[PDB]
Homo-oligomer: A and B are copies of this chain.
Amino acid sequence: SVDQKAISTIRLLAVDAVAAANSGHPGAPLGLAPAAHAVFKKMRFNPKDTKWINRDRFVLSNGHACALLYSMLVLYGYDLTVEDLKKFRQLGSKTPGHPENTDVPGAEVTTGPLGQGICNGVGIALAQAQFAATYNKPDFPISDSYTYVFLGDGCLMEGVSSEASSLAGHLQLGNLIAFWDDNKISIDGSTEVAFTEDVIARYKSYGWHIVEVSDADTDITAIAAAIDEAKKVTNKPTLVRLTTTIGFGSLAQGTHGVHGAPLKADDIKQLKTKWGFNPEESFAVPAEVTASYNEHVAENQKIQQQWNELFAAYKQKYPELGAELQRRLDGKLPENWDKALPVYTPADAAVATRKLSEIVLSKIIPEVPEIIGGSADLTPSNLTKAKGTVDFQPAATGLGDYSGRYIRYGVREHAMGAIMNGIAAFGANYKNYGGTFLNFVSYAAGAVRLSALSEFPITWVATHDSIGLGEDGPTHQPIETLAHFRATPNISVWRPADGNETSAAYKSAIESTHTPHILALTRQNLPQLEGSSIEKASKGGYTLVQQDKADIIIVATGSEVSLAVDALKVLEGQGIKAGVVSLPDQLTFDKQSEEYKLSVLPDGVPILSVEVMSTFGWSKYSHQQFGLNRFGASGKAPEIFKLFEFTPEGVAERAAKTVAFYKGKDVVSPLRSAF
């Protein structure tokens, strides 16, 4: 049949791509081609409009199998060709060794790090449910799309997928349909050596529906029926067990050797001949297959055409909601939304930046409907919920509704991070956030790094940023954490010092379209600073206290800016004149003009950094660095600061030593470099 020919075409494109590269993973593509064929036939998508908001989404969580995904996208006429497949895994190609949403048309997310994709799918489905609950009306199914995920044994072993699957079951996400490639093979061999759990029983314990397909090597009728069955179960996510043979058809099928290395040339020849292809030909695309696939594309395009008319009719009947939806699909925030940001003066009371964050969220959530977010079981400590909002829950629970805006993630930081990526990936201008303690953002590093690589505007509300948290002690107090994330490309790491800086941090986080944000916020109260503003803090770094005859400039962040200002007063008594720079985001600062940056960190004056955590990175901005490069302590926070000499007198002492160290030396800005 043409279906059989399509499946063979997919299999052989994937194997030929791997062969051309002499690198990559043929096994799972061979095993999953029947399922991929069946799922893509059920999916609604437009290869010529990858951003249609009511498309079904597909996620390849087992991202190493990407030769499969690329083959589907090529066959369906996405902006990806056979010539791109011939450049699989080659420098600069549109067919990288794992899929990247920034590079591959039709890749919704970036996968390859196991476990992430299924969690991203949970997020896409969460967003779809929230979006549909917000906009759909009688006779106006604006959003009714599904989220299809392929995953393997590796994803099922990674703890992040357990977190997300538990939560997805709790959230009754009926439009999520995941497919487990049950092939009993991972890199170390049989799953019998390390993975003997009853996966199906575990998924039932989370509240998922199960469908089993015992011969997924051939039975596309049963795979299609499993999708139909899943669609009838509207209050549970579904796991479809696909029992497959890894490398199906290969001489080496059912072995770990077929997982991750090119097939032998003679193996590829026998594959081709057994399936009716020419063993002398590579990258064959039978025109029957193209035609069949084009039929499905044409049908899908007519569905999108009708959706566009539905949307026009919706704007007529529901003018307010229609305009809001249009704005969001155009990628634009509400006009002058930022007028809602709180502004402070130096006469206002001291406030912890976690509390300032709560206040910002309380003002901006009502103004910007595309903001949703949650906390990983730290809502009353992170202060991440705006009073009066309702939680995102299935209405059946009585605990919230899908139109809700606040997500109870539970103690699941890693899944929260990957779910945030999925919510961003959904689109419709979602600006989504997740709260935990800064030290436990580290639990989610796998996902955070992908936020940066994927260019997703997600936001971590990362409270309890330092030894300032006090008694919980060194297991809770960040040391390395800011250095880690600042060293990752494309992460804005805001550490606001006061009310105005906190508003600037949120302005940046919400306006972001391509850069994830981490907001490092305090437990302890900080004063409102003389000289701060949203405008100045929006530059990432700025001169807080200008001293035209400075003997030294002190550059600081967050809680240490007030400390630097107090140190300036101590220094004045010692006959030393200091300026103060506040550097609430190093990335934003780095992006300013060379002239702007030199106005903040000039030549001809020693510069001392002060921040109560690692000194790594700080030499970009300073000549000497006062930081904390050891673990913290359990005690009252002011006593910990005193112990480590983060006091006005301790900073002044180090400032004075810095001035003395550079006496009779020529000093140039830390911004200067040889190349």
Residues of A at under 8 Å CB distance from B?
Answer: 21, 23-24, 63, 89-93, 96-98, 100, 110-115, 153-155, 157-163, 166-167, 169-170, 186-188, 192-199, 201-202, 204-207, 256, 375, 377-381, 391, 393, 397, 399, 408-412, 414-415, 439-440, 442-443, 445-446, 449-450, 452-453, 470-476, 479-480, 483-490, 614, 616-617, 619, 624, 626, 629-631, 633-636, 639-640, 643, 653-654, 657-658, 660-662, 665-666, 673-675
The 22 sampled A-B contact pairs (Cβ below 8 Å) are: A89-B473, A89-B635, A90-B634, A91-B639, A98-B472, A98-B473, A100-B475, A113-B440, A154-B411, A157-B412, A158-B412, A158-B443, A159-B159, A159-B163, A194-B408, A194-B410, A199-B205, A201-B205, A443-B445, A483-B484, A654-B675, A661-B674
Task: List, in ascending order, chain B residues with CB within 8 A of A207's CB.
Answer: 196-197
B100 and A474 within 8 A (CB): yes
A163 and B170 within 8 A (CB): no
B633 and A92 within 8 A (CB): yes
Task: List, in ascending order, chain B residues with CB within 8 A of A440's CB.
Answer: 113, 446
Q: How far is the CA of A204 from the CA of B660 in the complex (A)?
A: 68
- Of B97, B202, B636, which one neighbours A202 at CB under 8 angstroms? B202
Closest to A195 in B: B410
A170 and B197 within 8 A (CB): yes
CB distance from A282 to the nearest CB of B (A): 19
Task: List, in ascending order, chain B residues with CB within 8 A of A660's CB.
Answer: 674
Task: List, in ascending order, chain B residues with CB within 8 A of A256's CB.
Answer: 380
- Of B89, B157, B166, B170, which one neighbours A634 at CB under 8 angstroms? B89
CB distance from A117 to the nearest CB of B (A): 11
B397 and A192 within 8 A (CB): yes
CB distance from A27 to the nearest CB of B (A): 14
B92 and A635 within 8 A (CB): yes
B159 and A415 within 8 A (CB): yes
A204 and B206 within 8 A (CB): no
B476 and A487 within 8 A (CB): no
Are A475 and B112 CB-contacts (below 8 A) given A98-B634, A411-B186? yes
Q: How far is the CA of A415 from the CA of B162 in the complex (A)?
A: 13
Task: List, in ascending order, chain B residues with CB within 8 A of A196's CB.
Answer: 169-170, 207
A91 and B634 within 8 A (CB): yes
Task: List, in ascending order, chain B residues with CB within 8 A of A193's CB.
Answer: 391, 393, 399, 408
Most chain B CB atoms below 10 A, which of A194, A201, A414: A194
Task: List, in ascending order, chain B residues with CB within 8 A of A614's CB.
Answer: 487
- Of B192, B198, B472, B624, which one neighbours A675 at CB under 8 angstroms? B624
- Of B91, B114, B157, B616, which one neighbours A483 at CB under 8 angstroms? B616
A110 and B657 within 8 A (CB): no
CB distance from A76 to the nearest CB of B (A): 22
Number of chain copies forming the complex: 2
Closest to A486 in B: B616
A446 and B446 within 8 A (CB): no
Closest to A186 in B: B377
CB distance from A96 to the nearest CB of B (A): 4
Are A377 and B194 CB-contacts (below 8 A) given A24-B471, A450-B475? yes
Q: How far is the CA of A633 from the CA of B629 in the complex (A)?
A: 33
Task: List, in ascending order, chain B residues with CB within 8 A of A192's CB.
Answer: 397, 399
Closest to A259 in B: B380
Task: List, in ascending order, chain B residues with CB within 8 A of A635's CB.
Answer: 89-93
- Of B92, B415, B636, which one neighbours A91 at CB under 8 angstroms? B636
Are A205 and B195 CB-contacts (below 8 A) given A97-B471, A449-B480, A487-B483? no
B446 and A474 within 8 A (CB): no
Q: How far is the CA of A411 from the CA of B445 in the complex (A)?
A: 16
B634 and A96 within 8 A (CB): yes
CB distance from A505 to the nearest CB of B (A): 21
Q: How far is the CA of A613 from the CA of B172 in the complex (A)?
A: 43
Are A489 and B186 CB-contacts (below 8 A) given A377-B157, A411-B114? no
Task: List, in ascending order, chain B residues with CB within 8 A of A475's CB.
Answer: 63, 98, 100, 110-113, 450, 453
Are A197 and B205 CB-contacts (below 8 A) given A471-B89, A675-B654? yes
**9 closest A-B pairs (Cβ-Cβ)?**
A159-B159, A91-B635, A96-B634, A194-B410, A112-B475, A661-B674, A619-B619, A484-B484, A162-B162
CB distance from A521 to the nearest CB of B (A): 17
- Of B380, B643, B665, which one neighbours A187 at CB under 8 angstroms? B380
Task: List, in ascending order, chain B residues with CB within 8 A of A375's CB.
Answer: 188
Closest to A382 in B: B187
Task: List, in ascending order, chain B residues with CB within 8 A of A113's CB.
Answer: 439-440, 443, 475-476
Task: List, in ascending order, chain B residues with CB within 8 A of A675's CB.
Answer: 624, 626, 653-654, 657-658
Q: How far is the CA of A399 from the CA of B190 in the complex (A)?
A: 11
A640 and B91 within 8 A (CB): yes
Closest to A87 in B: B635
Task: List, in ascending order, chain B residues with CB within 8 A of A657's CB.
Answer: 674-675
Task: List, in ascending order, chain B residues with CB within 8 A of A640's CB.
Answer: 91
Q: How far is the CA of A633 from the CA of B102 in the complex (A)?
A: 12
Q: How far is the CA of A115 from the CA of B162 in the complex (A)?
A: 13
B411 and A673 within 8 A (CB): no
Q: How far is the CA of A443 from the CA of B440 in the complex (A)?
A: 12
A674 and B112 within 8 A (CB): no
CB distance from A515 to the nearest CB of B (A): 13
Task: List, in ascending order, chain B residues with CB within 8 A of A408's CB.
Answer: 188, 193-194
B154 and A169 within 8 A (CB): no
B629 and A489 within 8 A (CB): yes
Task: List, in ascending order, chain B residues with CB within 8 A of A443's CB.
Answer: 113, 158, 160, 445-446
Task: List, in ascending order, chain B residues with CB within 8 A of A414's CB.
Answer: 159
Task: List, in ascending order, chain B residues with CB within 8 A of A479's CB.
Answer: 487-489
